[PDB]
Amino acid sequence: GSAKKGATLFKTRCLQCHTVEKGGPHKVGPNLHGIFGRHSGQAEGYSYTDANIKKNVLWDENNMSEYLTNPKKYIPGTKMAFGGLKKEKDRNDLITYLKKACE
């Protein structure tokens, strides 16, 4: 994908909830640092929902595209109020941007 347009998508459709850095801001959504192996959620006092905890799913490139295409369809009852990346070109542009900021 394109890691430079993914910076634009994340700043406009994700930064008001999530911050991929090092701390734990947890504005509305949890932090997305080190999204390689987390399955359901993380243990940092962040009150998740019993929607994503059910049936742990490794955060891979192919399944997050399913999650960012339709969030509630992929996880029924998720608190993340997001419309969805209905396109696949910008879905590859964004996931390319996330994986580079998880070191």
Partner: protein
């Protein structure tokens, strides 16, 4: 003297599936032009456009409203409180060419209903039969509310729209969608975290976040949050009033009731000033793109 009676004549040879083709045309362009207003979409602006055309109604003489759809004329097109709605107009302009049979009143109203359902909001039944009227019936400027007012101004303005306290607090929950623009209305900042997703966050971040009355770059005073949110005075006044607060706290702890109450209030809002016969069909409930496999 007698008041004006605006009878709703359904479009000649037009069934439910025909209006469903207009809904899909609107809903698809919402998905195509995804980068508008920094990837907010035309969703929020099409809701505000639908309300402003329905907000010029006056129950005392039955003037204004969404029936005539006189937004095509330059009089109410360049109102000082209507700046920024041109984007929703030119959004529906190619659609009105695709379906030249529909009335502008029905297009303007259907656009707002389409936006709420496509933004994961409650289903809003919708009727047809709005008719286009000439220019001499275009409402004058100033029939819309002011952003810098009080809860007393809120309740007094919505009596002219014939809506009680419960319907007002419901319709305000739609303001968690979109963003205020300095170049348009004199207030800057976004309303909520989900810019284009219909949720009850308007009631949550109003009661949970910390608000301070700050000053923006237009000398206007607005209520800003510690998380980046902001509302206008006419909004923040809802919690200054005890009767509104009892409804704000109800919609904040129970989203299901806020969704059911919004539909009836928002349908009533779009149907104000329209006299339907008994031969008129039941109000339509269109299918969203997601329910149609998209």
């Amino acid at each position: 003297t007698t008041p004006l009676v605006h009878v709703a004549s359904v479009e000649k040879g037009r069934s439910y599936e025909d209006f469903q083709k207009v809904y899909n045309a609107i809903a698809l362009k919402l998905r195509e032009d995804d980068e508008y207003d920094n990837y907010i979409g035309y969703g929020p602006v099409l809701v505000r456009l639908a309300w402003h055309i329905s907000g010029t109604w006056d129950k005392h003489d039955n003037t204004g409203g969404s029936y005539g759809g006189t937004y095509r004329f330059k009089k109410e097109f360049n109102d000082p409180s209507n700046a920024g709605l041109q984007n929703g107009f030119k959004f529906l302009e190619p659609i009105h060419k695709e379906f030249p049979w529909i009335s502008s009143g029905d297009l303007f109203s259907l656009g707002g209903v389409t936006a709420v359902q496509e933004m994961q909001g409650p289903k809003i039944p919708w009727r047809c039969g709005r008719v286009d009227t000439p220019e001499d019936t275009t409402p004058d400027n100033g029939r819309l509310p002011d952003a810098d007012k009080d809860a007393g101004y809120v309740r007094t303005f919505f009596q002219r729209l014939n809506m009680n306290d419960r319907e007002v607090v419901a319709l305000m929950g739609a303001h968690a969608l979109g963003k205020t623009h300095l170049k348009n209305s004199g207030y800057e900042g976004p309303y909520g975290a989900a810019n284009n997703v219909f949720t009850n966050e308007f009631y949550l971040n109003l009661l949970n976040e910390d608000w301070k009355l700050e000053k923006n770059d237009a000398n206007n005073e607005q209520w800003d949050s510690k998380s980046g949110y902001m509302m206008h005075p006419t909004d923040y006044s809802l919690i200054q009033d005890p009767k509104y607060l009892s409804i704000v706290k109800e919609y904040a702890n129970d989203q299901d009731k806020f969704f059911k109450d919004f539909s009836k209030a928002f349908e009533k809002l779009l149907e104000n000033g329209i006299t339907f016969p008994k031969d008129a069909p039941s109000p339509f409930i269109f299918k969203t793109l997601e329910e149609q496999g998209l």
